[PDB]
């Protein structure tokens with residue numbers, strides 16, 4: 001009887017571990033999604049940053065004359 | 066905004082006896098049926114009008130019928146401390162018991178007193194003008210709860226139709242159970258609860274015993290201790306219809322908000338803080354802690370570990386001084402936790418209602434007065450464990466056709482025995498199919 | 502001349518409008534008793550826009566209060582500044598909606614819209630010349646969303662050339678009060694993008710952030726969120742109620758802020774927002790008001806502009822100040838955030854100045870903004886709607902009440918094309 | 928004997944699950960660190976946007 005009790009406890013514990021595992025896996029999918037989205041936003045920002053340098057260079061070229 | 070109660074069977078009547086005490090105390094009604102004169106608590110000129118009438122000359126009467134076949138419990142109530150509270154005709158008592166026989170309670174004896182019970186329901190509901198719905202209390206471990214209860218649900222759904230039916234049904238505990246032939250009655254009552262109740266809040270006994278021995282610290286509890294906290298849960302659920310609050314939640318969106326499918330309606334109930342009169346003042350009880358204590362696995366009124374499946378829809382009722390900000394923060398933390406995973410198709414899972422009435426207290430109870438309380442009703446997918454567990458030990462009996470003669474001697478058939486068996490099979494299959 | 506009529510329903514609508522009526526009554530100087538006690542005649546010269554005097558100096562607001570449940574209307578009558586609403590404005594609901602767009606727009610509407618529309622017609626024709634309708638409601642609720650959009654459509658059918666100003670609270674993922682939020686919001690947007698004239702989309706998480714940071718209120722609550730939101734509704738008609746060097750009515754604001762008819766979802770801001778622990782340690786004039794009003798975190802929407810661009814913006818100043826400094830501040834901030842203003846629409850910012858600052862203050866600045874970053878809120882609503890509709894969850898409550906899935910697809914594709922056009926303007 | 932064997936199998940299984948959980952949570956911490964760093968980089972880039980825009984306008988105003 002005691003051995004069956006501890007067996008049931010072990011089953012509950014391992015199912016808790018499994019549910020934590022797949023919850024973490026779904027959280028991983030989520031965080032990877034935000035990682036892609038945020039790199040995209042930062043790439044747009046740095047593209048705008050690089051665009052300004054060319055415009056200011058052109059302004060300097062036109063102001064030299 | 067009026068709701069009526071019907072109590073069927075020993076468990077139903079006893080829970081109602083331990084609940085109407087709380088109701089009258091909460092609204093300040095004296096046990097003899099009239100409010101006092103000089104003492105004045107709260108403003109409730111229509112806050113009493115939900116569960117109680119008012120017979121003109123200051124004598125409130127509850128909107129409830131108790132009904133039994135074994136007249137012992139009913140006349141115990143009739144001679145108890147609430148002789149005057151009840152109407153002398155809402156307490157219906159037949160002659161002979163059903164004796165753990167769904168067939169005897171639903172076919173032979175049941176069909177001779179439901180005609181009076183539902184007539185009383187008719188000429189009780191004619192007295193209201195804002196009726197919301199019914200709520201039933203029954204144990205499916207016996208005859209009166211299963212048989213007469215299923216018959217009354219059938220003949221009330223066919224009569225009043227659209228109105229909601231909040232069931233508060235006591236399933237047997239997995240291994241602890243007084244009755245022995247009770248799995249048969251459990252499946253027979255399931256095959257009527259599935260298609261005739263909009264929301265069926267489950268209640269168990271080992272779970273409540275575990276609660277009242279771990280948190281409440283009462284190592285020798287009893288039914289007078291179980292029914293008190295069951296009544297606490299009922300009152301926390303139905304407080305909004307009686308008390309105004311920051312965010313009132315009424316009976317329609319418990320269905321339009323917690324029942325994503327026409328058949329997947331099975332509630333796990335929880336209540337925090339289940340606390341004693343010694344730990345109470347030594348613990349700082351705020352929204353975050355009470356919510357975490359509500360959501361811990363070993364705080365559910367039904368013994369099933371809600372880690373196997375996923376949560377489909379949670380509803381949290383708060384009583385007492387709680388602000389929207391900290392409850393929003395608490396549910397945010399609950400979502401952030403790593404132990405519970407919500408179902409995928411339901412991103413927003415919680416609905417929080419709030420009320421300004423602090424939890425009541427019964428002199429002579431174990432739950433000390435507290436500033437606030439939370440009651441959760443959660444539609445989950447971890448009830449397939451319960452249903453399959455009962456199914457296996459039904460099959461064990463049914464293989465040998467044991468006890469079946471007691472049923473066929475009153476009108477059952479192996480046809481509907483197998484029908485209820487495959488009905489449970491279909492229900493658990495539906496849970497498996499919806500979980501994915 | 503110009504007359505505004507107020508329409509208010511749902512818990513959000515009723516509570517927010519109660520705080521609104523409190524604020525405006527206190528500003529015009531009338532007590533909750535219903536009589537005038539002010540001194541300056543500027544508080545009397547324009548009472549007609551919001552009030553209709555009945556007899557002997559007893560003023561009654563021009564509002565309509567609608568609900569399917571007495572639980573909120575009893576509370577609003579219990580609350581202060583609630584003894585002024587005419588009882589005829591209480592179209593009295595008995596049953597309730599229970600978080601159901603179908604119930605609010607197809608079942609309860611059948612027997613409540615007739616009464617509410619007759620009352621609103623009485624109110625509108627009771628004046629000399631309509632300026633327009635000011636409606637407040639939700640999108641995720643039961644009565645404010647469904648019945649609100651029903652009444653909005655009916656009024657747009659009846660009065661086709663009067664302006665419609667909606668103040669609609671939009672659900673946010675952080676604060677999830679219910680679960681039918683995606684369906685309700687989608688089905689309300691379906692009506693709003695076609696019938697409503699212009700809509701102030703608002704939320705609750707932004708208001709809570711404001712109370713945390715810019716107000717430092719330790720324990721914010723709805724009783725203060727409603728005040729904060731009511732401030733801008735009281736301030737948006739400062740021109741209509743008061744003189745000024747450069748007036749601008751609702752028609753002026755709309756013709757300045759709506760380049761194309763399908764762009765009427767604006768964000769709101771209010772300045773100055775400061776705690777009582779810092780009201781004594783700050784300076785109040787046009788530069789700091791401009792900074793606080795162009796601050797990205799001062800928005801009352803779950804849509805920061807820094808991921809999008811401004812099609813247009815408008816400022817409503819109240820208090821004596823130099824239009825020279827106002828104009829130079831606007832030009833300076835335009836140059837500062839050139840990347841956040843669409844280039845091919847020069848002078849993206851419009852300004853207006855009035856005479857009387859709000860009571861208890863010497864200066865104020867309300868802000869309205871049409872920016873193509875508002876599509877983020879609709880994106881994170883549509884994601885929830887998709888994740889729900891793919892499983893057809895919670896769907897029987899609607900589909901067993903006269904609906905089907907074709908209009909679900911209609912609303913979904915509506916938001917898809919709307920965010921698409923916002924992007925292609927970006 | 929059978930029940931004890933089942934116990935041992937269960938404990939081995941749950942140990943494997945625990946090890947996988949630990950590696951997953953460590954990788955989660957790494958992801959969150961990358962989150963914070965990249966958001967900081969975005970703030971710096973936005974400040975650069977504003978400064979360069981102002982320089983552009985000031986230079987152009989001469990022409």
Ligand SMILES: Nc1nc2c(ncn2[C@@H]2O[C@H](COP(=O)(O)OP(=O)(O)OP(=O)(O)O)[C@@H](O)[C@H]2O)c(=O)[nH]1
Pocket residue numbers: 073074075076077079080134162163164165166170203204205206207208209210211235242243244269270288289291292
């Ligand atoms: N939790 C709880 N359970 C109760 C209480 N009273 C009775 N029960 C349950 O009721 C079951 C007894 O079967 P019932 O369905 O009540 O049968 P009955 O109501 O006496 O009617 P008959 O079956 O005809 O005798 C027991 O297994 C208990 O679990 C109670 O006060 N609290």
Ligand SMILES: Nc1nc2c(ncn2[C@@H]2O[C@H](COP(=O)(O)OP(=O)(O)O)[C@@H](O)[C@H]2O)c(=O)[nH]1
Pocket residue numbers: 311312510511512513516598599600605639641642643644645646647672678679705723724726727
């Ligand atoms: N700002 C604010 N929002 C509220 C308040 N009460 C409820 N809400 C929001 O309103 C929504 C519910 O709308 P509801 O009142 O049910 O709509 P109705 O049923 O048609 O009247 C919820 O999502 C809440 O977040 C309040 O007092 N203040």
Ligand SMILES: [Mg+2]
Pocket residue numbers: 074075135162163164207208209
């Ligand atoms: Mg019995």
